[PDB]
Design a protein around this ligand. Structure first.
Ligand SMILES: COC1=C(OC)C(=O)C(C/C=C(\C)CC/C=C(\C)CC/C=C(\C)CC/C=C(/C)CC/C=C(\C)CC/C=C(\C)CC/C=C(\C)CC/C=C(/C)CCC=C(C)C)=C(C)C1=O
Ligand SMILES: CCCCCCCCCCCCCCCCCC(=O)OC[C@H](COP(=O)([O-])OCC[N+](C)(C)C)OC(=O)CCCCCCCCCCCCCCCCC
Ligand SMILES: CCCCCCCCCCCCCCCCCC(=O)OC[C@H](COP(=O)(O)OCCN)OC(=O)CCCCCCCCCCCCCCCCC
Ligand SMILES: CCCCCCCCCCCCCCCCCC(=O)OC[C@H](COP(=O)(O)OCCN)OC(=O)CCCCCCCCCCCCCCCCC
Ligand SMILES: NC(=O)C1=CN([C@@H]2O[C@H](COP(=O)(O)OP(=O)(O)OC[C@H]3O[C@@H](n4cnc5c(N)ncnc54)[C@H](OP(=O)(O)O)[C@@H]3O)[C@@H](O)[C@H]2O)C=CC1
Ligand SMILES: COC1=C(OC)C(=O)C(CC=C(C)C)=C(C)C1=O
Ligand code: SF4
Ligand code: SF4
Lengths: 317, 198, 178, 157, 339, 385, 92, 43
């Protein structure tokens, strides 16, 4: 039965991963006055499966100058961490509820920065190394504010367990309070998934770095990873800040609304991509260290003070 | 028949005399075409001096270099005819200063007078082979890295002498003497009858 | 007449109201939200794409497309080998050699348009006195092998016979203009 | 149906469909034919609909469309990019400049065709080969990819 | 015939219309290269899908290379291929007896039918290629079967040239790559510790040029040339040398062949192109025969090219980033054995 | 300095560009652009081709502004022949010249964004661009590479429905500029990527021979369309959009304004196009009409000679510059009395601009260089010629 | 264990893909800025640590000391940032 | 006689100037919205 549940979480998520790609190629399309992929299958539903098969069949190329492990470990790690982070998520019931759940999600995300570092060193070509170094920096920087923004949340939730927020948000979303950080969580979620406004990790016009030497099966695995993440981080926004209504008698309206909010915020980063030009490498770090980190550290203190003098210290457990 | 204003053919003509007078050491001929265009002609040594006077003279400011080109009249002893076309945004007029250079008698470079010429002078060396002294970095611009011969010279075959194909044996692109599958049909077009006195 | 773009006519001194409006613009990304609205708007517009095989992008009569050699209604090929179509071709594409046919008429023994050499200028359409060589409407003649693209008299005459009905309609529509 | 032959015919039909449906092209971008495809990528004749990627790096590209003249200075590169593309790979030569030398055939700086440099699968004709015309050529590549029977040949080899 | 006009390069004519049935091969690729360079008309019968023969298209010029669909079991396909050719070159061969084709077929059965038709057609000359040192009694079924063929084809086609090349040295060859690829194997077995099986490699091009020159020379009729090489080698130096350029450790450990023929049997069972072959193994330890015979290279006009000279290009792909820049001069040469 | 080349295949390299960059860290200290990857021999081939059969070559030098390019050759050859195009033809060349500047600017603004990372502006305008080519195709038969503007006059009269269709496109086009206007002109992300990048001072721009929006962007007031009015640019009213400071933003804003100003010029041309002939009536220069050559001997002789031999323009030389969308496009045509030219130096606004990349991209990141090439609107056909 | 079960399936799923992916088909880039960032990053990462126990420390009976401590930590690091800005650091 | 020409009286007028609309909520009012959310949310 546990395996059944393991399958129920991973298989559906992976399929959702696939169709996000399709949805990204139609919502971007209609925004740009074009139908998008509808000719393969009915309305393009078979389109995600089609290139998956093309990608796996095409010859995986191992560059003459390339490590053969820091090359194959990197996509395996990227898919493994991203699919793994869906293990401890309240929907509303988590598969493996962990008392220090949010620290698990923060730690597992942090490990993905390596895959970028390992792939860049493994390729042994200049475009890859330059891209990886800037990339690791972006990801790491957007971790420092990412973590502090969560610590502010937790202090108003009382615990690290993601399951507690379902009881914290039984009367109001944590967006109303703490909206200023939501925005800053959303922008940081956009950076950590290397999506558009912050896609310098792999700029195309700039260094066509992460998958330069990655084609076919390796390309796919990170690829899959990114999109699953795209969902996971959006889903974490939909639990931590937008709290779906929870009724203990019927648990699925929680998941039904979790479904609706996650899809809309997942739709939002698709909409962000088409709408904005990409930021400069330093313009990106200028935002986090200058614009956001002082806002986050100060609002972090406000969230240690709001509890005490408003006699609202949250109940542990 | 095009409309022609003689106001210009007079203005430009006068200027020509003015330039000539101011720079008599180098100006050999100064003509105005029937198309109202002035074309001071200078000894090759006057390249630096004549340009500078035009770039920096209150009564003749010719700030930008429209173009530097070299017609090649093979008959002419001095094969190339370096032509510099300049524009004066202040006086809304253009002038052309043209000099003569043979294959192995280099011309001075004007990169100092106008930095626009940094590239065009490299273009003239690559295509025609004229050399420009004091050029910051003269090196082929348009032709292939290993190209031998100056292409726009009238004595260079259009198709050229080398063409490229990929050879499997050597797994690398390889020049071979040009072998064309339909030679350029050289239609003779000149008519045996003249048009006017000109 | 000139026009300054990006020239600030004067120094509006900050007024709290102004400052707030601005600070709000930086803090709550107001203009960024403006941009998102524009793309959401089109998402709702009808897409302009056409089903390519089923629907075709419109081409009017002068479209040059693919070369064809026409024939008189009687059945006598129009070309009389004056060979100025060869003379005015910019790319040297058309190769024509001729000899007096048995009938005694002038005709081309070999007419070869190298389509890879041709740059579809449409001057040949222009130059022909009998208008034997025409720019036919078809643009879809992509070929697996390079040799197929080279076209001799028989392919062009066959191309002419296949598309004669539309070529005649197209020339009918545009001849007054020429 | 039951026959090791039928299973091997159906499965390539599957393998061929995947390659056919998702061709990620890589355009070098020489001369002007690249524009006449930027029009194919554009809304009147979307290519994505057909499963075509607007921009794909060489290592992730199934099809190379050579648009424009291949000069004798870009030849040594085209071959490199063709050589560095993943194995399943196809070339579409667009423009009379690329499939044959076109205007500029007799030039000393232009390779008379990309077929001399890279093996070419479909030749799309026209000075600016029309954008439908490229789309017909890409669709002709898809007809060529459907006909290929790699698994059948391995079975009866 | 076709009077030879031109300057000598592509887009020129040499007048050799030649069916070449096994062109897709490693040797083949080279044969079509020169034939195409010279300007000869080359008909390439092929069975593999068009995708795989694309590499042959750019070779040769337009309308100079023609590809025909052909099946070995179907006699009619061979019939039409040689219809309009005046030179037929046979390079049909394999190392692994495939499910539907036996060594006899690939070497003796098929290469007969082919020359047989060629005669019916009236082709001026047929060149048949069989492996070097091929006794009708040689151990490897392959070599013996090949020997069987060179005899037969002479009765189907008299005065048919029979070049008999040694194992070939070239990029994409086996002789050189096989050993270099033993890297995956931690240890590199070598029967008799790689001794007493002196081997003389021959560059592929030399072989190709030689073959081509045959097509355009009256001196070769019924000749059984033997393209051999510029220097012989005990398998030991060869193996190490290879590993030397590849810059990968060399660990020669002797392996009793009786057991090794079994290893060949193992990979041989592989469905997808067994990497080693029982018939291979024997061949590898089958000593190169001595050079007393109608000479090949040089005799046919090409001076052999030493192995060390081009080895760098063949073995480069097997090096690691660390050694990629390394050059031949840095490395040492192997030693020959006039024995 | 970690030398790295911006190799041709990369999308930001316009297909052919090998910018040898010296990366002092991510900051780039020197650029040595290696053009020549698309040199076709355009100017050595023209010497072997008659004046009409060399027109087509001029549609392929800058391949995004075809007709304005072929208006520079047409004006040159016309000068050397002391012939002037008929009144209707001159308006048609100005009508098609501004459709080309809208077409080039949609190319330059949207592809610049494609390089920076904004993808939607390209798709919205490119649909508006095929609407425009249709106008080329409906008047010449070629979507691009028309050959419509002939050395004397233009080739064929406008079809009877084109001016109504050009009104409907121009009527609704401005909203389309307004729409990318909102999506890419105030985005802090665009401004940051474009503002204060590649500033070029006024005197430096004149000295480097920039001569284009690059000249106007830094505040120098020069438009060959008003200063030296070619064709009818003396009878149409427009405002040159001079920018103030020179950052890549002011240059973008200028390009967006010129699209708007061109709609003002297109409006005037549709409102005031004269009834008349489209090509000069001298059979010696412009080919005789199809009916005339098939009924009058003097016309067949003139058609035969013009197509087979040529105009035989009188001996002379001229440099004629027109304001092509990129900048000043000029042809220095030297002519012997022969029907085929002797020299044709195509001045390319772009050979000068690309030279400026090293000076303009000073103290700038790898990413800034992508913007610097984008703001020069460089098409390598014109530079390589 | 339950987690172990999930994770090994997770690695298995990824190793399966790469394996099929490889089986079905049948020098001196340095800028102190980059190093400097990494450093700053840990100085901040360590601080994140000293700040992580704050959810448990909220419930501490003291409260006054808690906040007095936490506010001092956040303020002193932020000043570190302040000097990073003031100095060329953070100015890439 | 019949040639493609502007309609009699000329065509209508075409807009070229930017028509970007300055439509938005005033800044003070805007701040209040977010501030109010926080103020209430905290309570
Ligand atoms: C330059 O490199 C490239 C990119 O990186 C920037 C791309 O993103 C792209 C664009 C690619 C896309 C958006 C479409 C690709 C989408 C996919 C591979 C997703 C397909 C879905 C799957 C992998 C199947 C889902 C999971 C499974 C394996 C089984 C399910 C249980 C291209 C074309 C590219 O070449
Ligand atoms: C139904 C779909 C609605 C889509 C709304 C966005 C697209 C339409 C925009 C239309 C437009 O142009 O107006 C923009 C307008 C245009 O204004 P402007 O930028 O032109 O100037 C007005 C503002 N002043 C004058 C002060 C400068 O932008 C705004 O009004 C301000 C938007 C602030 C947004 C702050 C960040 C987003 C909100 C974060 C908190 C969470 C909110 C809820 C999140 C989801 C919860 C489920
Ligand atoms: C791939 C590399 C990353 C692997 C995925 C990331 C896994 C991260 C695990 C973080 C720690 C998880 C944890 O602490 O949960 C402990 C769990 C429950 O403990 P607790 O929360 O305290 O609840 C007690 C009362 N309910 O109960 C436990 O005790 C779980 C014990 C650890 C379970 C780990 C599962 C396997 C992960 C390691 C796989 C190793 C193989 C791969 C090695 C990769 C090396 C790079
Ligand atoms: C008490 C508090 C009073 C009110 C406080 C308001 C706090 C606002 C919180 C975020 C602050 C962000 C910020 O300050 O701006 C940084 C940057 C714009 O700043 P910039 O113009 O670069 O200023 C330069 C100065 N160095 O901002 C950016 O660059 C934004 C870039 C965004 C790219 C994607 C934008 C997507 C926008 C739509 C989604 C917004 C999130 C909505 C969903 C949230 C979760 C539901
Ligand atoms: N080291 C060497 O290479 C040596 C080779 N030789 C001889 O030279 C010849 C060429 O060798 P090489 O090129 O390496 O051989 P390959 O393994 O490269 O194959 C040669 C060609 O034969 C074709 N072929 C093989 N089996 C069949 C079949 N049953 N029906 C139809 N065609 C077939 C193949 O076509 P496809 O792949 O399409 O089936 C291939 O193109 C061989 O015959 C060999 O006996 C002699 C001495 C040394
Ligand atoms: C508009 O300027 C140019 C581009 O950049 C946006 C290019 O991408 C390209 C080529 C691009 C590809 C890959 C189609 C060309 C030719 C060009 O002119
Ligand atoms: S012009 Fe017309 S008629 Fe004269 S040859 Fe060319 S095609 Fe035949
Ligand atoms: S083919 Fe015609 S269009 Fe394509 S590049 Fe050569 S010239 Fe430009």
């Amino acid at each position: 039965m546990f395996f059944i549940n393991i399958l129920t979480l991973l298989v559906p998520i992976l399929i959702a991963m696939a169709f996000l790609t399709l949805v990204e190629r139609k919502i971007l399309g209609y925004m740009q006055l074009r139908k998008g992929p509808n000719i393969v299958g009915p309305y393009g539903i078979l389109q995600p499966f089609a290139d998956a098969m093309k990608l796996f069949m095409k010859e995986p190329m191992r560059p003459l100058t390339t490590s053969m492990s820091l090359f194959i470990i990197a996509p395996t790690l990227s898919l493994t961490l991203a699919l793994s982070l869906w293990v401890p998520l309240p929907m509303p019931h988590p598969l493996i509820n962990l008392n220090l759940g949010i620290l698990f999600i923060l730690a597992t995300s942090s490990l993905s920065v390596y895959s970028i570092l390992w792939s860049g060193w493994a390729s042994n070509s200049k475009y890859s190394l330059f891209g990886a170094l800037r990339a690791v920096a972006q990801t790491i920087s957007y971790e420092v504010t990412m973590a502090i923004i969560l610590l502010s949340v937790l202090l108003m939730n009382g615990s690290y367990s993601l399951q507690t927020l379902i009881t914290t948000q039984e009367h109001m979303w944590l967006l109303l309070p703490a909206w200023p950080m939501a925005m800053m969580w959303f922008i940081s979620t956009l950076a950590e998934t290397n999506r558009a406004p912050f896609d310098l990790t792999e700029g195309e016009s700039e260094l066509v770095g992460f998958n330069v030497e990655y084609a076919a099966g390796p390309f796919a695995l990170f690829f899959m990873a990114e999109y699953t993440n795209i969902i996971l981080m959006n889903a974490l926004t939909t639990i931590i800040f937008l709290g779906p209504l929870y009724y203990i008698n019927l648990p699925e309206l929680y998941s039904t609304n979790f479904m609706m909010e996650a899809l809309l915020l997942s739709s939002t980063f698709l909409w962000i991509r088409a709408s904005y030009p990409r930021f400069r490498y330093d313009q990106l770090m200028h935002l986090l260290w200058k614009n956001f980190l002082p806002l986050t550290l100060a609002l972090c203190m406000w969230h240690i003070s709001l509890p005490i003098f408003t006699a609202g210290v949250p109940p542990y457990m | 028949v095009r409309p022609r204003s003689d106001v210009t053919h007079k203005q430009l003509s006068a200027f020509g005399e003015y330039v000539a007078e101011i720079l008599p050491k180098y100006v050999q001929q100064v003509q105005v075409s029937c198309l109202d265009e002035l074309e001071i002609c200078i000894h090759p040594d006057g390249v630096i001096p004549t340009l500078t006077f035009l770039r920096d003279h209150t009564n003749a400011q010719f700030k930008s270099l429209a173009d530097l080109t070299a017609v090649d009249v093979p008959t002419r002893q001095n094969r190339f005819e370096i032509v510099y076309n300049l524009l004066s945004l202040r006086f809304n007029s253009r002038i052309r200063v043209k000099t003569y250079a043979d294959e192995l008698t280099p011309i001075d470079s004007i990169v100092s007078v106008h930095i626009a010429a940094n590239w065009y002078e490299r273009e003239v060396w690559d295509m025609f082979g004229v050399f420009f002294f004091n050029h910051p970095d003269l090196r082929r611009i348009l032709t292939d890295y290993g190209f031998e011969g100056h292409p726009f010279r009238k004595d260079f075959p259009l198709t050229g002498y080398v063409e490229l194909r990929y050879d499997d044996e050597v797994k690398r692109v390889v020049a071979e003497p040009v072998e064309l599958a339909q030679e350029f049909r050289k239609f003779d077009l000149n008519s045996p009858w003249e048009a006017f006195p000109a | 007449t000139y026009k300054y773009v990006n020239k600030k006519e004067q120094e509006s001194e900050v007024d709290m109201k102004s400052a707030t409006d601005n600070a709000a613009r930086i803090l709550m990304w107001t203009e960024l939200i403006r941009g998102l609205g524009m793309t959401l708007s089109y998402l709702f517009r009808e897409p302009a794409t056409i089903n390519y095989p089923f629907e075709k992008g419109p081409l009017s009569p002068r479209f040059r497309g693919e070369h064809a050699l026409r024939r008189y209604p009687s059945g006598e090929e129009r070309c009389i080998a004056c060979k100025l179509c060869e003379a005015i071709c910019p790319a040297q594409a058309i190769t024509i050699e001729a000899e007096p046919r048995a009938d005694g008429s002038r005709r081309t023994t070999r007419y070869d348009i190298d389509m890879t050499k041709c740059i579809y200028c449409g001057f040949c359409q222009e130059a022909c006195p009998v208008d034997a060589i025409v720019e036919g409407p078809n643009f879809e003649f992509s070929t697996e092998t390079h040799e197929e693209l080279l076209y001799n008299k028989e392919k062009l005459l066959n191309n002419g016979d296949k598309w004669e009905a539309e070529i005649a309609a197209n020339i009918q529509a545009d001849y007054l203009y020429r | 149906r039951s026959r090791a032959e039928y299973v091997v015919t159906k499965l390539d039909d599957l393998i061929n469909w995947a390659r056919r449906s998702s061709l990620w092209p890589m355009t070098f971008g020489l001369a002007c034919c690249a524009v006449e495809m930027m029009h194919m990528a554009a809304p009147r004749y979307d290519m994505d609909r057909f499963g075509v990627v607007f921009r794909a790096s060489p290592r992730q590209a199934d099809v190379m469309i050579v648009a424009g003249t291949l000069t004798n200075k870009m030849a040594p590169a085209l071959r490199k990019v063709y050589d560095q593309m993943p194995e399943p790979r196809y070339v579409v030569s667009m423009g009379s400049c690329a499939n044959g030398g076109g205007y500029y055939h007799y030039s000393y700086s232009v390779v008379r065709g990309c077929d001399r440099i890279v093996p070419v699968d479909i030749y799309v004709p026209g000075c600016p080969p029309t954008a439908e015309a490229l789309l017909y050529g890409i669709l002709q590549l898809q007809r060529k990819i459907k006909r290929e029977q790699k698994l059948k040949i391995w079975y009866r080899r | 015939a076709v009077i030879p006009h031109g300057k000598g390069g592509r887009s020129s004519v040499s007048g050799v219309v030649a069916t070449v049935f096994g062109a897709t091969g490693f040797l083949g690729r080279y044969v079509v290269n020169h034939l195409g360079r010279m300007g000869s008309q080359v008909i390439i019968p092929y069975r593999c899908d068009v995708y795989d023969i694309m590499h042959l298209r750019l070779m040769g010029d337009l309308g100079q290379l023609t590809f025909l669909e052909w099946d070995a079991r179907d006699k009619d396909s061979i019939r039409k291929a040689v219809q309009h050719s005046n030179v037929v070159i046979n390079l049909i061969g394999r190392e692994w007896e495939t499910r539907n084709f036996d060594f006899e077929d690939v070497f003796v059965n098929i290469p007969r039918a082919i020359a047989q038709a060629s005669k019916e057609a009236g082709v001026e000359r047929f060149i048949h290629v069989s492996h070097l040192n091929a006794s009708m009694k040689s151990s490897s079924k392959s070599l013996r079967s090949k020997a069987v063929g060179e005899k037969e084809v002479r009765s189907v086609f008299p005065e048919a040239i029979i070049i008999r090349p040694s194992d070939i040295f070239g990029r994409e060859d086996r002789f050189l790559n096989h050993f270099a690829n033993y890297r995956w194997f931690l240890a590199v077995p070598l029967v008799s510790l790689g001794f007493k099986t002196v081997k003389q490699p021959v560059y592929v091009a030399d072989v190709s040029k030689g073959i081509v020159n045959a097509t355009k020379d009256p001196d070769a009729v019924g000749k059984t040339f033997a393209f051999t090489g510029p220097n012989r080698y005990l398998l030991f130096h060869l193996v190490k040398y290879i590993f030397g350029m590849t810059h990968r450790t060399f660990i020669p450990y002797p392996l009793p062949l009786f057991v090794y023929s079994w290893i060949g049997k193992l990979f041989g069972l592989s469905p997808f192109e067994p990497w080693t072959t029982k018939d291979k193994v024997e061949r590898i330890h089958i000593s190169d025969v001595m050079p007393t015979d109608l000479p090949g290279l040089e005799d046919l006009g090409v001076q052999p090219t030493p192995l060390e000279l081009k080895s760098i290009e063949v073995l480069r792909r097997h090096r690691t980033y660390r050694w990629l820049s390394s050059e031949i001069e840095e490395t040492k040469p192997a030693k020959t054995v006039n024995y | 300095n970690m030398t790295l080349n911006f190799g041709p295949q990369h999308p930001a390299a316009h297909g052919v560009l090998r910018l040898v960059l010296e990366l002092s860290g991510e900051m780039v200290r020197k650029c040595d652009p290696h053009i020549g990857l698309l040199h076709r021999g355009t100017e050595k081939l023209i010497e072997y081709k008659t004046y009409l059969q060399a027109l087509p070559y001029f549609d392929r030098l800058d391949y995004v502004s075809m007709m304005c390019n072929e208006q520079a050759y047409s004006i040159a050859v016309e000068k050397l022949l002391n012939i002037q195009p008929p009144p209707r033809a001159q308006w048609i060349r100005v009508l098609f010249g501004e459709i080309t500047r809208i077409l080039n600017h949609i190319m330059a603004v949207t592809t610049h964004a494609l390089d920076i990372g904004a993808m939607t502006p390209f798709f919205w305008m490119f649909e508006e661009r095929e609407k425009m080519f249709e106008f080329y195709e409906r008047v010449s038969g070629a979507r691009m590479h028309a050959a419509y503007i002939r050395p004397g006059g233009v080739h064929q009269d406008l079809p009877l429905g084109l001016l109504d269709d050009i009104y409907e496109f121009s009527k609704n086009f401005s909203l389309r500029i307004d729409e990318v206007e909102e999506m890419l002109t105030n985005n802090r992300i665009w401004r940051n990527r474009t503002v204060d990048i590649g500033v070029v001072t006024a005197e430096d721009a004149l000295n480097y021979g920039f001569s284009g929006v690059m000249l106007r962007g830094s505040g120098i007031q020069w438009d060959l369309r008003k200063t030296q009015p070619y064709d009818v640019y003396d009878q149409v009213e427009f405002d040159v959009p001079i920018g103030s400071r020179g950052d890549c933003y002011d240059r973008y804003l200028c390009r967006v304004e010129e699209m708007r100003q061109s709609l003002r010029i297109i409006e005037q041309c549709l409102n005031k196009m004269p009834p008349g002939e489209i090509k000069v009536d001298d059979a010696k220069v412009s080919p005789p009409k199809r009916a005339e050559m098939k009924t009058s001997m003097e016309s067949l002789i003139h058609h035969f000679k013009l197509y087979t031999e040529g105009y035989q323009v009188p001996p002379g030389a001229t440099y004629t510059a027109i304001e092509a969308p990129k900048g000043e496009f000029g042809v220095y045509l030297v002519s012997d009395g022969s029907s085929r030219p002797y020299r044709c130096k195509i001045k390319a606004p772009g050979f000068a601009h690309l030279a400026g990349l090293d000076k303009m991209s000073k103290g700038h990141m790898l990413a800034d260089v992508v913007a610097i090439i984008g703001t020069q609107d460089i098409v390598f056909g014109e530079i390589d010629r | 264990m339950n987690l172990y079960t999930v994770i090994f399936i997770n690695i298995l799923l990824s190793l399966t893909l790469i394996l099929v992916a490889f089986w079905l088909p049948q020098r001196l880039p340095f800028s102190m800025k980059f190093f400097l960032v990494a450093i700053t990053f840990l100085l901040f990462d360590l601080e994140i640590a000293l700040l992580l126990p704050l959810p448990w420390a909220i419930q501490t009976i003291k409260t006054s000391t808690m906040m007095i401590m936490a506010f001092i930590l956040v303020t002193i690091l932020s000043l570190g940032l302040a000097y990073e800005w003031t100095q060329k650091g953070l100015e890439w | 006689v019949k040639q493609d020409m502007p309609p009699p009286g000329g065509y209508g007028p075409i807009d070229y100037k930017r028509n970007l609309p300055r439509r938005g909520l005033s800044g003070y009012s805007m701040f209040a919205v977010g501030i109010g959310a926080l103020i209430f949310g905290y309570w």
